[PDB]
Design a protein around this ligand. Sequence first.
Ligand SMILES: O=P(O)(O)O[C@H]1[C@@H](OP(=O)(O)O)[C@@H](OP(=O)(O)O)[C@@H](OP(=O)(O)O)[C@@H](OP(=O)(O)O)[C@@H]1OP(=O)(O)O
Ligand SMILES: [Cl-]
Ligand SMILES: [Zn+2]
Length: 350
Amino acid sequence: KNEISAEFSDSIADAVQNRFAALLQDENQSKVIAAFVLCIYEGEDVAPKLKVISIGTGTKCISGEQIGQKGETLNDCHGEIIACRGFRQFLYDELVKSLQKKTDVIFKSKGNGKFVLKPNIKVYLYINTAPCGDGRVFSLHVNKTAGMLRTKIENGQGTIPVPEERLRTMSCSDKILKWNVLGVQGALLSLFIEPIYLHGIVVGLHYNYDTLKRALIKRIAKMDSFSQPYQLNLPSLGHPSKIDAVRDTSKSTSNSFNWYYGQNTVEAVNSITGQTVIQTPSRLCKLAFFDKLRLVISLSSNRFAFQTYHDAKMLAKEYQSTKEYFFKALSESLCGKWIGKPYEHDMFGY
Ligand SMILES: O=P(O)(O)O[C@H]1[C@@H](OP(=O)(O)O)[C@@H](OP(=O)(O)O)[C@@H](OP(=O)(O)O)[C@@H](OP(=O)(O)O)[C@@H]1OP(=O)(O)O
Ligand SMILES: [Cl-]
Ligand SMILES: [Zn+2]
């Protein structure tokens, strides 16, 4: 089976609820809430400390219309993706600290140049509702569309199978499946740290163990032929007991909120524009990551030669080759072909 207990899922959901209330001024118009949660063991005999590292909300993404090409526009403002981006920023900040040789850090050195997450720290993903895409498809083991890659529709609201409307965004279920192959950290961070994999995933509304197992973990049921430190991650799946309530009333908001550890402030993003509500680039946009990367580069003792963001990502050779094998495994298993943006979106510099 491999299901988190109700008590522990409620523990995770409770901590997310408490942090959310501490950040947002009394008003709940957010429909999708996600978070990344650290579970920190002091010893393995006592209960762990739970620490909410990032929060995202949102239900929408950009049309090709508003997409910029300076990396100043958020492509995807679904709360789960926004939560991951914030967690990535956290990883960067922690990586800096480790490079400035601080002690209060989640990383230790691995004797290959690259940091590894301390083994007493476990990462959990929480979402108050099943992720869009395959994770909301309920089918028995006997099925057309079950298991397929899906793309987000009409600025986020809805997913449909990949073409088997120009260049679209993959569903949250497919992105989480990807994170369980390549880690949550992305190409760039993998230059400096070993892949960080989710230990567990806690899902509220529309939970079904078998659906989420297929969607997020065991979809290809092949892969293997993996090269350490990459593997098929098998996180446990959990469901909390109570939920804030479905509320499909009227319509969803275009606002997407984010917070992550070490920020004093909640940033509010217009999901239709991919930028802040004061027409500025988000602290989570590609360009903000690219700034962080060079910060990191200057504190590193290595040199890095790349013209663009795109080229920098291609430096992560282990990640990129596992990514390519993953995409092929999906196509071979008849899950469809991944739709990735064209390279020119990432061909910017600074
Ligand atoms: O693998 P990563 O380092 O995490 O880069 C990914 C990713 O991959 P590629 O670098 O392989 O293109 C996505 O791009 P596509 O799969 O669409 O090509 C992009 O997803 P979106 O285009 O849907 O935004 C995603 O960002 P997200 O957090 O939105 O999932 C993020 O790119 P960045 O970290 O560079 O933004
Ligand atoms: Cl929302
Ligand atoms: Zn989604």
